[PDB]
Design a binder for this molecule. Sequence first.
Ligand SMILES: Cc1c[nH]c2ncnc(NC[C@]3(O)CC[C@H](O)CC3)c12
Ligand SMILES: [Cl-]
Length: 167
Amino acid sequence: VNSFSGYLKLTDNVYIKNADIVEEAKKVKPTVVVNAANVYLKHGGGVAGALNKATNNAMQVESDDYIATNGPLKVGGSCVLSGHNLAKHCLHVVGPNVNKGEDIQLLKSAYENFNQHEVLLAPLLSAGIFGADPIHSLRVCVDTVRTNVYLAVFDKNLYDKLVSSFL
Ligand SMILES: Cc1c[nH]c2ncnc(NC[C@]3(O)CC[C@H](O)CC3)c12
Ligand SMILES: [Cl-]
């Protein structure tokens, strides 16, 4: 039993809710919140910009030190950093950004990072400003993640389309 509330159960392990991931994290304080990161951990917009804003830019400060030490992530890769005031940890995961020409096949590799964590709060990878089809992202999530994932979908209209089209 966990404290996630109001989710629709899609499969044995995948759950979904119309919610602002920032407000969800603040309420649940999950062990792991997933950020829709880029390889430079520049948290400018989309989910990343919103999460970072909620940390008063502390996520960005920590991220800049991480990059200065380690260099950029790989597309499809991840790193674990602090969750600041939102969660114990933040798993920064880089899905392919279609608006940069990146290979959508890397979306499965991106979701594989979730399997290193027993429970996660997460957005759909590569959705929104990363330009992928969210119906496709949800399908890859369900077919790749085996751990317990609670998906927050900000757009109510999109949430209804994902549910009604889910196979
Ligand atoms: C940007 C943002 C702020 N807070 C959030 N909380 C959860 N997801 C988010 N973004 C991606 C998406 O969920 C996928 C599909 C739709 O195009 C739009 C919403 C955000
Ligand atoms: Cl977005």
